[PDB]
Amino acid sequence: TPEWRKQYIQYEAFKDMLYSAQDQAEDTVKRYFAKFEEKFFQTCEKELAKINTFYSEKLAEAQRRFATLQNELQSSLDAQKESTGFHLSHEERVQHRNIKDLKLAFSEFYLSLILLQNYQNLNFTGFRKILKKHDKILETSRGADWRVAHVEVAPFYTCKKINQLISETEAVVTNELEDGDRQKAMKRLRVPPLGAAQPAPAWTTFRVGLFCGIFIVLNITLVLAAVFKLETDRSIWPLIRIYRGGFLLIEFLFLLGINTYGWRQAGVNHVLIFELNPRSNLSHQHLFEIAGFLGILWCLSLLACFFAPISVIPTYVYPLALYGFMVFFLINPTKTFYYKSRFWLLKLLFRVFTAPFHKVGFADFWLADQLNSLSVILMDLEYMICFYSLELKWDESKGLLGVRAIVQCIPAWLRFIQCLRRYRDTKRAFPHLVNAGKYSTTFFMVTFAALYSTHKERGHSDTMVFFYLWIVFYIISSCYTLIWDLKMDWGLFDKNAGENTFLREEIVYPQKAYYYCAIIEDVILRFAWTIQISITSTTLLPHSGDIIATVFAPLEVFRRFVWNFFRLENEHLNNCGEFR
Amino acid sequence: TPEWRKQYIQYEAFKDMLYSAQDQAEDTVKRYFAKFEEKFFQTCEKELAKINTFYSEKLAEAQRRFATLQNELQSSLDAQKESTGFHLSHEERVQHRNIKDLKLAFSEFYLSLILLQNYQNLNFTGFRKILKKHDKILETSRGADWRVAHVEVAPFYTCKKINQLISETEAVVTNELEDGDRQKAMKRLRVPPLGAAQPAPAWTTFRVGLFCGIFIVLNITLVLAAVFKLETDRSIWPLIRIYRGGFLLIEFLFLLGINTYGWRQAGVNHVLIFELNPRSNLSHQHLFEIAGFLGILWCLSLLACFFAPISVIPTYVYPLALYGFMVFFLINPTKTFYYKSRFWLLKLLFRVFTAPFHKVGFADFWLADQLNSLSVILMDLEYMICFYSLELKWDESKGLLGVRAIVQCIPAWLRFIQCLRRYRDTKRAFPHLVNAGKYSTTFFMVTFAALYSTHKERGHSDTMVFFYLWIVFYIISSCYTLIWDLKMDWGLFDKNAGENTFLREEIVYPQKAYYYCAIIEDVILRFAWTIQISITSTTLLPHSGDIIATVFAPLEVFRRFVWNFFRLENEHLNNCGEFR
């Protein structure tokens, strides 16, 4: 960097002479290289002091400049408001000159604060990794925990005033200089490529485009082929219900990409709350292209099952082949496409599915909540297993076309156990226990629906009472989950509405109409979710159950797409969440 | 910019008070605002002096730093070569430290020279546009030509040592620091986004991907549909020969995009020789996406002509509809998609087709040469006109499926007239007149072939002599055009081959195998081009003429794709070209 750096890292000399010593390589050599590590760590203290001092006085200069520019901004505002009253006596042009110079000064100040934030971040990363390397050399007694003690606090890193400074600078600038709108500041502060390493790389965007185009055209051909070629067999429900899982996954991945885009460009931090590595960013482009590729695979699988199989290949292979490809991509353990992200996702799966065992964090809870909505995927996988193990024709190849309650409750089971672990760790009341109650309502409703349906099939004369009980339990479950989604999980309908009518005290997204539409759709769609789960689980209604389930599931995934939006914004703004 | 600038432009104050004066607005007011313009232009002289002085001493400092770093590079090379002889007595690590510091110094020097080149370029653009604005105010007697006198030379801009400095810096750095390979310097000098304004913008790359994917899948569906549905009519030649023009245009546009990419990333300047605006760059992404969109249109047109028309729409509309869409896109005069580039292309078409009239430049000659190969497009348009005017069924809608020599010679006619205009302007010999002779060989061969074919149809007994004459004329035409393409139009086979065996003295592209493959394919493909033109023009051979013509035309466009590559590199390296 062409910045005022002396070394700021030591680059790689530490490692160069570490190699020079260790490669050369008991009696007194033990203590000799122990002393060498001791001077290594005294140089580490020297680096700590250097970064501490440099961050300290640069940050102090930043505060001084902030105060000076606040005074200048107040002076400019005073002279333009009630003090002066194309030419307009040239006073308006003088004020325009003041506006331009204020904007330039604020832009260079923004660049400087971004630069110092980058400086401290790159230091953090650098010397953390060098201490990691020293630990790998041989498991030093110091480092590791001692490194944490002297690094995680790191008086240069201790002061979290960088984030508050940048946030308040943006807020106060948009207050009057850019009338509270992101567009103008974005125009004059166009996110310089530094800080975020080439966001949306060229090739990733090209692949996003290619896969999205292939998906669009494949979908068009699929609609056309289904419309003009379906006839033949009169039982397409097995195929539609077997590919509903893939379709729901594709839709959820597209909408999660949209969620990441909205979080990134709406000013709501999401990497910090997700505890991801600051540099390992999964920008929306990566998620969009992964979802597009899986969509290409799904569409090709359905096309193959439709028109013609390679003219002598069991057509039941295509669902199995597609799902095997998906699971192999997710589980493949080598060092190929997106190995880091897949490994992180697998570790999260291990931490969440085997509950309570481990801690809770936030990613585990978020994924458990997402499964609470995607349970239709588990249902479809159970149906796949059952069909391909009992109702299949292993030799015949003329065409593919009481535990369901347990599998449907599995997501609610893991979420309930997660919340019980939360309660054990914290030993607290509501809102810790109310979540457990709400998620147990799902168990109660599903099991009572199953009992009522099996009694109806049996033909008992008391099914009216059980139906009434199911109605009341469904009502209370939907009401409690809606009240939870509005009050304790979104922050809306607070007692401090203030200016924001019927909304939270503070907001991040631009238009309130978005919030109103989201609330109305959520209230009208929680009933839909409950109805869908009950109906597709045990209501037993034939000839229409599959169609209703498959028209409601994608819309439920859309519900979760909105709910991610309006939770993770409440996690960063109000940030109750019990996490950190 | 956070650079050492005082104003470097005057930003917009010149225009601010120009508006303040002119809006306020004979007797003595005439001379009053004449004096105002006089002080405007004295301030322009002040700006000229400022930029001249600043460029002068910054450039002198650049030369001083260049000399100092040359001395340091020589010292490092001396100490690493024959002077010193993981550890290797630590001398190799000292030399590695020298390498790292030399690389860092050269990287910052490269950044500085790029910065000063940007400074002078942005000045040029800025004050050129402000003088343009002053001219628009009211057609000042000064400015315009006086502005050219005091701007185009511009002692800050007069010294073209910037280009030679950057080029020799790259060359000398790759000489030993990066062993003559672009990859290493590219790795450590990754084309900072400054200078080229966000090359390949995100949305343009996304559209490139989308259109390329739609094109790939449409092509797959087209192959499948043609293979499994062609039957029906036994006369597909009208359709194939009517869409051959569109296919050739799509292929040529894709290959021209590849040409622009190769020029851009192979270190061969192409904007300067094309006299395009320095900022209005048509990166390869734009050309690729335009070609992809036209390909989507063509593929959809063929699909519509294939399967089913919207079930009651004359199927002959689809070729007409596609070509009307293309011509409307090219000719539409509003301020919509790529208006600047389309207007430039239309002006070039006017300057080239109406020859000699205007001057020659280089873009006109290049486009005339490209038409000399794409003449099949003119032939296909002539066939379209003839068919749709004489052999069509205006009412019947059951299915669409001696001037040809003149239209085939039209490109050679315009090129010949262009070269005659060149000769008139310059009053010179070979290589100015040899081009005219070579392009007249095409007239001679085509007309003699036509006469021989019409005599053969007539049944004259002297067709043997005419066939022999056509053979000899074809031989001499192919030989002369090949000798021209190798000697005077590529620079290859020079008498100063030196190290480069059988090649030019200096080369730009990395691998010589590329040059050898290109020469061999050109020698074996010029015969193919001549055969194709003669056969598709008048050889009269039925039942095979269309197929041979349509297998050879795309390959001829490929020939021109290679020839652009290896001419515009000879235009920048040897730069004979008679132009500038």
Side-chain angles (χ1 to χ4, degrees), chain A residues 13 16 20 23 86-87 97 202 205-206 209-210 213-214 217, chain B residues 13 16 20 23-24 86-87 97 202 205-206 209-210 213-214 217:
Chain A
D16 298 328
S20 311
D23 215 353
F86 185 96
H87 322 334
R97 272 278 205 178
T205 309
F206 163 68
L210 160 56
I214 302 281
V217 56
Chain B
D16 298 328
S20 311
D23 215 352
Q24 198 278 297
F86 185 96
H87 322 334
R97 272 278 205 178
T205 309
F206 163 68
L210 160 56
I214 302 281
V217 56

PDB file of all heavy atoms in Angstrom, chain A residues 13 16 20 23 86-87 97 202 205-206 209-210 213-214 217, chain B residues 13 16 20 23-24 86-87 97 202 205-206 209-210 213-214 217:
ATOM      1  N   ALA A  13       9.583 -11.513   7.397  1.00  0.00           N
ATOM      2  CA  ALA A  13      10.902 -11.736   7.984  1.00  0.00           C
ATOM      3  C   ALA A  13      10.814 -12.636   9.208  1.00  0.00           C
ATOM      4  O   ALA A  13      11.702 -13.467   9.446  1.00  0.00           O
ATOM      5  CB  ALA A  13      11.541 -10.398   8.348  1.00  0.00           C
ATOM      6  N   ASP A  16      10.813 -15.938   7.832  1.00  0.00           N
ATOM      7  CA  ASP A  16      12.072 -16.238   7.159  1.00  0.00           C
ATOM      8  C   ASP A  16      13.125 -16.699   8.156  1.00  0.00           C
ATOM      9  O   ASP A  16      13.716 -17.775   8.003  1.00  0.00           O
ATOM     10  CB  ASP A  16      12.561 -15.009   6.390  1.00  0.00           C
ATOM     11  CG  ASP A  16      11.594 -14.578   5.305  1.00  0.00           C
ATOM     12  OD1 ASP A  16      10.924 -15.456   4.721  1.00  0.00           O
ATOM     13  OD2 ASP A  16      11.506 -13.363   5.034  1.00  0.00           O
ATOM     14  N   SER A  20      14.900 -20.200   9.116  1.00  0.00           N
ATOM     15  CA  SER A  20      16.357 -20.273   9.167  1.00  0.00           C
ATOM     16  C   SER A  20      16.833 -20.931  10.457  1.00  0.00           C
ATOM     17  O   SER A  20      17.815 -21.685  10.454  1.00  0.00           O
ATOM     18  CB  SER A  20      16.956 -18.873   9.031  1.00  0.00           C
ATOM     19  OG  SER A  20      16.395 -18.182   7.928  1.00  0.00           O
ATOM     20  N   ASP A  23      14.972 -24.923  10.850  1.00  0.00           N
ATOM     21  CA  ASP A  23      15.566 -25.881   9.925  1.00  0.00           C
ATOM     22  C   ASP A  23      16.967 -26.280  10.367  1.00  0.00           C
ATOM     23  O   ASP A  23      17.328 -27.460  10.291  1.00  0.00           O
ATOM     24  CB  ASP A  23      15.600 -25.300   8.512  1.00  0.00           C
ATOM     25  CG  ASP A  23      15.382 -26.351   7.438  1.00  0.00           C
ATOM     26  OD1 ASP A  23      15.344 -27.554   7.772  1.00  0.00           O
ATOM     27  OD2 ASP A  23      15.252 -25.973   6.255  1.00  0.00           O
ATOM     28  N   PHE A  86     -30.027  31.496 -10.866  1.00  0.00           N
ATOM     29  CA  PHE A  86     -28.658  31.015 -10.735  1.00  0.00           C
ATOM     30  C   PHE A  86     -27.822  31.989  -9.911  1.00  0.00           C
ATOM     31  O   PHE A  86     -26.915  31.581  -9.185  1.00  0.00           O
ATOM     32  CB  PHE A  86     -28.023  30.815 -12.115  1.00  0.00           C
ATOM     33  CG  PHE A  86     -26.644  30.217 -12.071  1.00  0.00           C
ATOM     34  CD1 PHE A  86     -26.460  28.855 -12.236  1.00  0.00           C
ATOM     35  CD2 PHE A  86     -25.530  31.018 -11.873  1.00  0.00           C
ATOM     36  CE1 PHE A  86     -25.194  28.303 -12.200  1.00  0.00           C
ATOM     37  CE2 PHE A  86     -24.264  30.471 -11.833  1.00  0.00           C
ATOM     38  CZ  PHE A  86     -24.095  29.112 -11.998  1.00  0.00           C
ATOM     39  N   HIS A  87     -28.130  33.282 -10.028  1.00  0.00           N
ATOM     40  CA  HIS A  87     -27.334  34.300  -9.342  1.00  0.00           C
ATOM     41  C   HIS A  87     -27.769  34.436  -7.885  1.00  0.00           C
ATOM     42  O   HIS A  87     -26.995  34.153  -6.964  1.00  0.00           O
ATOM     43  CB  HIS A  87     -27.456  35.643 -10.070  1.00  0.00           C
ATOM     44  CG  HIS A  87     -27.487  35.527 -11.562  1.00  0.00           C
ATOM     45  ND1 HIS A  87     -26.915  34.472 -12.241  1.00  0.00           N
ATOM     46  CD2 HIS A  87     -28.027  36.333 -12.507  1.00  0.00           C
ATOM     47  CE1 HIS A  87     -27.102  34.633 -13.539  1.00  0.00           C
ATOM     48  NE2 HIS A  87     -27.773  35.756 -13.728  1.00  0.00           N
ATOM     49  N   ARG A  97     -20.559  26.509  -3.249  1.00  0.00           N
ATOM     50  CA  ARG A  97     -19.131  26.269  -3.059  1.00  0.00           C
ATOM     51  C   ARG A  97     -18.870  25.637  -1.698  1.00  0.00           C
ATOM     52  O   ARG A  97     -18.066  24.703  -1.570  1.00  0.00           O
ATOM     53  CB  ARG A  97     -18.362  27.585  -3.192  1.00  0.00           C
ATOM     54  CG  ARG A  97     -17.933  27.937  -4.607  1.00  0.00           C
ATOM     55  CD  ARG A  97     -16.658  27.209  -5.005  1.00  0.00           C
ATOM     56  NE  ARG A  97     -15.923  27.927  -6.039  1.00  0.00           N
ATOM     57  CZ  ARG A  97     -14.764  27.533  -6.547  1.00  0.00           C
ATOM     58  NH1 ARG A  97     -14.181  26.410  -6.154  1.00  0.00           N
ATOM     59  NH2 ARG A  97     -14.170  28.284  -7.470  1.00  0.00           N
ATOM     60  N   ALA A 202     -15.507 -10.835 -11.690  1.00  0.00           N
ATOM     61  CA  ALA A 202     -16.037 -10.864 -13.049  1.00  0.00           C
ATOM     62  C   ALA A 202     -16.536 -12.254 -13.419  1.00  0.00           C
ATOM     63  O   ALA A 202     -17.669 -12.416 -13.888  1.00  0.00           O
ATOM     64  CB  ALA A 202     -14.968 -10.397 -14.035  1.00  0.00           C
ATOM     65  N   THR A 205     -19.774 -13.336 -11.690  1.00  0.00           N
ATOM     66  CA  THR A 205     -20.957 -12.708 -12.270  1.00  0.00           C
ATOM     67  C   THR A 205     -21.291 -13.317 -13.625  1.00  0.00           C
ATOM     68  O   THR A 205     -22.468 -13.510 -13.953  1.00  0.00           O
ATOM     69  CB  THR A 205     -20.751 -11.202 -12.398  1.00  0.00           C
ATOM     70  OG1 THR A 205     -20.296 -10.669 -11.150  1.00  0.00           O
ATOM     71  CG2 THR A 205     -22.054 -10.525 -12.774  1.00  0.00           C
ATOM     72  N   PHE A 206     -20.271 -13.625 -14.429  1.00  0.00           N
ATOM     73  CA  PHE A 206     -20.534 -14.265 -15.712  1.00  0.00           C
ATOM     74  C   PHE A 206     -21.212 -15.612 -15.522  1.00  0.00           C
ATOM     75  O   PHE A 206     -22.151 -15.951 -16.250  1.00  0.00           O
ATOM     76  CB  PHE A 206     -19.242 -14.442 -16.501  1.00  0.00           C
ATOM     77  CG  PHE A 206     -19.364 -15.424 -17.625  1.00  0.00           C
ATOM     78  CD1 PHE A 206     -20.146 -15.135 -18.726  1.00  0.00           C
ATOM     79  CD2 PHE A 206     -18.711 -16.637 -17.575  1.00  0.00           C
ATOM     80  CE1 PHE A 206     -20.264 -16.036 -19.762  1.00  0.00           C
ATOM     81  CE2 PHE A 206     -18.828 -17.542 -18.608  1.00  0.00           C
ATOM     82  CZ  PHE A 206     -19.607 -17.241 -19.702  1.00  0.00           C
ATOM     83  N   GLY A 209     -24.807 -15.156 -14.607  1.00  0.00           N
ATOM     84  CA  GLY A 209     -25.615 -14.888 -15.782  1.00  0.00           C
ATOM     85  C   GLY A 209     -25.862 -16.135 -16.609  1.00  0.00           C
ATOM     86  O   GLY A 209     -26.986 -16.402 -17.036  1.00  0.00           O
ATOM     87  N   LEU A 210     -24.809 -16.919 -16.840  1.00  0.00           N
ATOM     88  CA  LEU A 210     -24.947 -18.113 -17.666  1.00  0.00           C
ATOM     89  C   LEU A 210     -25.942 -19.087 -17.052  1.00  0.00           C
ATOM     90  O   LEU A 210     -26.857 -19.571 -17.730  1.00  0.00           O
ATOM     91  CB  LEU A 210     -23.578 -18.767 -17.854  1.00  0.00           C
ATOM     92  CG  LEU A 210     -23.523 -20.233 -18.281  1.00  0.00           C
ATOM     93  CD1 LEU A 210     -24.284 -20.447 -19.567  1.00  0.00           C
ATOM     94  CD2 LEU A 210     -22.079 -20.670 -18.446  1.00  0.00           C
ATOM     95  N   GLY A 213     -29.549 -17.761 -17.147  1.00  0.00           N
ATOM     96  CA  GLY A 213     -30.139 -17.858 -18.472  1.00  0.00           C
ATOM     97  C   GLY A 213     -30.514 -19.282 -18.831  1.00  0.00           C
ATOM     98  O   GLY A 213     -31.602 -19.542 -19.361  1.00  0.00           O
ATOM     99  N   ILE A 214     -29.617 -20.229 -18.548  1.00  0.00           N
ATOM    100  CA  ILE A 214     -29.938 -21.629 -18.802  1.00  0.00           C
ATOM    101  C   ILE A 214     -31.160 -22.034 -17.993  1.00  0.00           C
ATOM    102  O   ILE A 214     -32.021 -22.778 -18.471  1.00  0.00           O
ATOM    103  CB  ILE A 214     -28.731 -22.532 -18.492  1.00  0.00           C
ATOM    104  CG1 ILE A 214     -27.514 -22.125 -19.325  1.00  0.00           C
ATOM    105  CG2 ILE A 214     -29.076 -23.982 -18.771  1.00  0.00           C
ATOM    106  CD1 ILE A 214     -27.554 -22.615 -20.741  1.00  0.00           C
ATOM    107  N   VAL A 217     -34.430 -20.475 -19.670  1.00  0.00           N
ATOM    108  CA  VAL A 217     -34.832 -21.157 -20.897  1.00  0.00           C
ATOM    109  C   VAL A 217     -35.265 -22.590 -20.607  1.00  0.00           C
ATOM    110  O   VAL A 217     -36.208 -23.101 -21.225  1.00  0.00           O
ATOM    111  CB  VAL A 217     -33.702 -21.118 -21.933  1.00  0.00           C
ATOM    112  CG1 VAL A 217     -32.454 -21.706 -21.338  1.00  0.00           C
ATOM    113  CG2 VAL A 217     -34.121 -21.868 -23.180  1.00  0.00           C
TER     114      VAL A 217
ATOM    115  N   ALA B  13     -16.028  26.246 -11.672  1.00  0.00           N
ATOM    116  CA  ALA B  13     -16.184  27.677 -11.421  1.00  0.00           C
ATOM    117  C   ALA B  13     -16.208  28.465 -12.722  1.00  0.00           C
ATOM    118  O   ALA B  13     -16.946  29.453 -12.849  1.00  0.00           O
ATOM    119  CB  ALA B  13     -15.057  28.169 -10.517  1.00  0.00           C
ATOM    120  N   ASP B  16     -19.614  28.231 -13.789  1.00  0.00           N
ATOM    121  CA  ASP B  16     -20.515  28.900 -12.857  1.00  0.00           C
ATOM    122  C   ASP B  16     -20.575  30.395 -13.136  1.00  0.00           C
ATOM    123  O   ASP B  16     -21.657  30.961 -13.332  1.00  0.00           O
ATOM    124  CB  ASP B  16     -20.067  28.639 -11.418  1.00  0.00           C
ATOM    125  CG  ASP B  16     -20.101  27.168 -11.055  1.00  0.00           C
ATOM    126  OD1 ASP B  16     -20.974  26.444 -11.579  1.00  0.00           O
ATOM    127  OD2 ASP B  16     -19.257  26.735 -10.244  1.00  0.00           O
ATOM    128  N   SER B  20     -23.256  32.961 -14.735  1.00  0.00           N
ATOM    129  CA  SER B  20     -23.618  34.168 -13.997  1.00  0.00           C
ATOM    130  C   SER B  20     -23.542  35.403 -14.887  1.00  0.00           C
ATOM    131  O   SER B  20     -24.372  36.314 -14.771  1.00  0.00           O
ATOM    132  CB  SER B  20     -22.709  34.330 -12.780  1.00  0.00           C
ATOM    133  OG  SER B  20     -22.636  33.128 -12.031  1.00  0.00           O
ATOM    134  N   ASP B  23     -26.098  34.820 -18.448  1.00  0.00           N
ATOM    135  CA  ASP B  23     -27.513  34.924 -18.111  1.00  0.00           C
ATOM    136  C   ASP B  23     -27.909  36.366 -17.828  1.00  0.00           C
ATOM    137  O   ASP B  23     -28.978  36.811 -18.257  1.00  0.00           O
ATOM    138  CB  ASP B  23     -27.836  34.038 -16.908  1.00  0.00           C
ATOM    139  CG  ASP B  23     -29.222  33.422 -16.987  1.00  0.00           C
ATOM    140  OD1 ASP B  23     -29.992  33.789 -17.899  1.00  0.00           O
ATOM    141  OD2 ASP B  23     -29.543  32.572 -16.130  1.00  0.00           O
ATOM    142  N   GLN B  24     -27.064  37.107 -17.106  1.00  0.00           N
ATOM    143  CA  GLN B  24     -27.320  38.526 -16.898  1.00  0.00           C
ATOM    144  C   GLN B  24     -27.330  39.276 -18.224  1.00  0.00           C
ATOM    145  O   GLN B  24     -28.187  40.136 -18.458  1.00  0.00           O
ATOM    146  CB  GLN B  24     -26.270  39.113 -15.953  1.00  0.00           C
ATOM    147  CG  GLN B  24     -26.672  40.435 -15.320  1.00  0.00           C
ATOM    148  CD  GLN B  24     -26.429  41.618 -16.236  1.00  0.00           C
ATOM    149  OE1 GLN B  24     -25.290  41.914 -16.599  1.00  0.00           O
ATOM    150  NE2 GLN B  24     -27.501  42.302 -16.619  1.00  0.00           N
ATOM    151  N   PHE B  86      17.398 -23.239   1.971  1.00  0.00           N
ATOM    152  CA  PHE B  86      16.773 -21.986   2.378  1.00  0.00           C
ATOM    153  C   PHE B  86      17.818 -21.009   2.906  1.00  0.00           C
ATOM    154  O   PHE B  86      17.685 -19.796   2.738  1.00  0.00           O
ATOM    155  CB  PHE B  86      15.704 -22.241   3.446  1.00  0.00           C
ATOM    156  CG  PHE B  86      14.934 -21.012   3.843  1.00  0.00           C
ATOM    157  CD1 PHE B  86      13.709 -20.729   3.263  1.00  0.00           C
ATOM    158  CD2 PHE B  86      15.430 -20.144   4.802  1.00  0.00           C
ATOM    159  CE1 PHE B  86      12.997 -19.603   3.628  1.00  0.00           C
ATOM    160  CE2 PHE B  86      14.725 -19.015   5.168  1.00  0.00           C
ATOM    161  CZ  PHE B  86      13.506 -18.745   4.582  1.00  0.00           C
ATOM    162  N   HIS B  87      18.859 -21.542   3.546  1.00  0.00           N
ATOM    163  CA  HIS B  87      19.873 -20.683   4.160  1.00  0.00           C
ATOM    164  C   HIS B  87      20.886 -20.213   3.119  1.00  0.00           C
ATOM    165  O   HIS B  87      20.991 -19.015   2.834  1.00  0.00           O
ATOM    166  CB  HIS B  87      20.575 -21.428   5.301  1.00  0.00           C
ATOM    167  CG  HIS B  87      19.663 -22.294   6.115  1.00  0.00           C
ATOM    168  ND1 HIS B  87      18.311 -22.049   6.236  1.00  0.00           N
ATOM    169  CD2 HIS B  87      19.909 -23.407   6.845  1.00  0.00           C
ATOM    170  CE1 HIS B  87      17.767 -22.974   7.005  1.00  0.00           C
ATOM    171  NE2 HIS B  87      18.715 -23.809   7.390  1.00  0.00           N
ATOM    172  N   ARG B  97      15.449 -10.433  -0.209  1.00  0.00           N
ATOM    173  CA  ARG B  97      15.034  -9.141   0.332  1.00  0.00           C
ATOM    174  C   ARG B  97      15.220  -8.041  -0.704  1.00  0.00           C
ATOM    175  O   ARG B  97      14.359  -7.166  -0.870  1.00  0.00           O
ATOM    176  CB  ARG B  97      15.839  -8.826   1.595  1.00  0.00           C
ATOM    177  CG  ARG B  97      15.240  -9.360   2.886  1.00  0.00           C
ATOM    178  CD  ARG B  97      14.147  -8.447   3.417  1.00  0.00           C
ATOM    179  NE  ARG B  97      13.981  -8.577   4.860  1.00  0.00           N
ATOM    180  CZ  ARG B  97      13.120  -7.877   5.584  1.00  0.00           C
ATOM    181  NH1 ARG B  97      12.304  -6.994   5.027  1.00  0.00           N
ATOM    182  NH2 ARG B  97      13.075  -8.062   6.900  1.00  0.00           N
ATOM    183  N   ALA B 202     -20.298  -4.926 -13.747  1.00  0.00           N
ATOM    184  CA  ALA B 202     -20.951  -6.129 -13.240  1.00  0.00           C
ATOM    185  C   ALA B 202     -22.155  -6.505 -14.094  1.00  0.00           C
ATOM    186  O   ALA B 202     -22.285  -7.653 -14.533  1.00  0.00           O
ATOM    187  CB  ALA B 202     -21.366  -5.922 -11.785  1.00  0.00           C
ATOM    188  N   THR B 205     -21.326  -7.912 -17.553  1.00  0.00           N
ATOM    189  CA  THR B 205     -20.873  -9.298 -17.502  1.00  0.00           C
ATOM    190  C   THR B 205     -22.033 -10.243 -17.222  1.00  0.00           C
ATOM    191  O   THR B 205     -22.100 -11.340 -17.789  1.00  0.00           O
ATOM    192  CB  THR B 205     -19.784  -9.464 -16.446  1.00  0.00           C
ATOM    193  OG1 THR B 205     -18.771  -8.471 -16.639  1.00  0.00           O
ATOM    194  CG2 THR B 205     -19.151 -10.837 -16.557  1.00  0.00           C
ATOM    195  N   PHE B 206     -22.958  -9.839 -16.348  1.00  0.00           N
ATOM    196  CA  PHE B 206     -24.120 -10.681 -16.090  1.00  0.00           C
ATOM    197  C   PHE B 206     -24.940 -10.885 -17.354  1.00  0.00           C
ATOM    198  O   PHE B 206     -25.398 -11.998 -17.632  1.00  0.00           O
ATOM    199  CB  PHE B 206     -24.993 -10.073 -14.998  1.00  0.00           C
ATOM    200  CG  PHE B 206     -26.374 -10.653 -14.953  1.00  0.00           C
ATOM    201  CD1 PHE B 206     -26.572 -11.961 -14.559  1.00  0.00           C
ATOM    202  CD2 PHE B 206     -27.468  -9.896 -15.316  1.00  0.00           C
ATOM    203  CE1 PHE B 206     -27.840 -12.501 -14.519  1.00  0.00           C
ATOM    204  CE2 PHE B 206     -28.737 -10.431 -15.279  1.00  0.00           C
ATOM    205  CZ  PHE B 206     -28.921 -11.736 -14.881  1.00  0.00           C
ATOM    206  N   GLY B 209     -23.245 -13.308 -19.641  1.00  0.00           N
ATOM    207  CA  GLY B 209     -23.496 -14.677 -19.229  1.00  0.00           C
ATOM    208  C   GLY B 209     -24.895 -15.140 -19.584  1.00  0.00           C
ATOM    209  O   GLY B 209     -25.089 -16.238 -20.105  1.00  0.00           O
ATOM    210  N   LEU B 210     -25.892 -14.298 -19.310  1.00  0.00           N
ATOM    211  CA  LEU B 210     -27.273 -14.681 -19.574  1.00  0.00           C
ATOM    212  C   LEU B 210     -27.488 -14.957 -21.055  1.00  0.00           C
ATOM    213  O   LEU B 210     -28.041 -15.998 -21.433  1.00  0.00           O
ATOM    214  CB  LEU B 210     -28.215 -13.585 -19.076  1.00  0.00           C
ATOM    215  CG  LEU B 210     -29.639 -13.538 -19.629  1.00  0.00           C
ATOM    216  CD1 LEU B 210     -30.347 -14.853 -19.401  1.00  0.00           C
ATOM    217  CD2 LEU B 210     -30.410 -12.406 -18.979  1.00  0.00           C
ATOM    218  N   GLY B 213     -25.652 -18.120 -22.242  1.00  0.00           N
ATOM    219  CA  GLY B 213     -26.328 -19.339 -21.829  1.00  0.00           C
ATOM    220  C   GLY B 213     -27.582 -19.604 -22.639  1.00  0.00           C
ATOM    221  O   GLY B 213     -27.834 -20.736 -23.074  1.00  0.00           O
ATOM    222  N   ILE B 214     -28.388 -18.563 -22.854  1.00  0.00           N
ATOM    223  CA  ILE B 214     -29.578 -18.729 -23.682  1.00  0.00           C
ATOM    224  C   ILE B 214     -29.175 -19.170 -25.081  1.00  0.00           C
ATOM    225  O   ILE B 214     -29.840 -20.008 -25.698  1.00  0.00           O
ATOM    226  CB  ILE B 214     -30.407 -17.432 -23.716  1.00  0.00           C
ATOM    227  CG1 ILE B 214     -30.819 -17.009 -22.305  1.00  0.00           C
ATOM    228  CG2 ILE B 214     -31.643 -17.623 -24.571  1.00  0.00           C
ATOM    229  CD1 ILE B 214     -31.986 -17.774 -21.757  1.00  0.00           C
ATOM    230  N   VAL B 217     -28.106 -23.016 -24.995  1.00  0.00           N
ATOM    231  CA  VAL B 217     -29.238 -23.929 -24.871  1.00  0.00           C
ATOM    232  C   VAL B 217     -30.128 -23.865 -26.109  1.00  0.00           C
ATOM    233  O   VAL B 217     -30.663 -24.888 -26.554  1.00  0.00           O
ATOM    234  CB  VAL B 217     -30.039 -23.629 -23.597  1.00  0.00           C
ATOM    235  CG1 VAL B 217     -30.466 -22.189 -23.599  1.00  0.00           C
ATOM    236  CG2 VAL B 217     -31.233 -24.556 -23.511  1.00  0.00           C
TER     237      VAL B 217
END
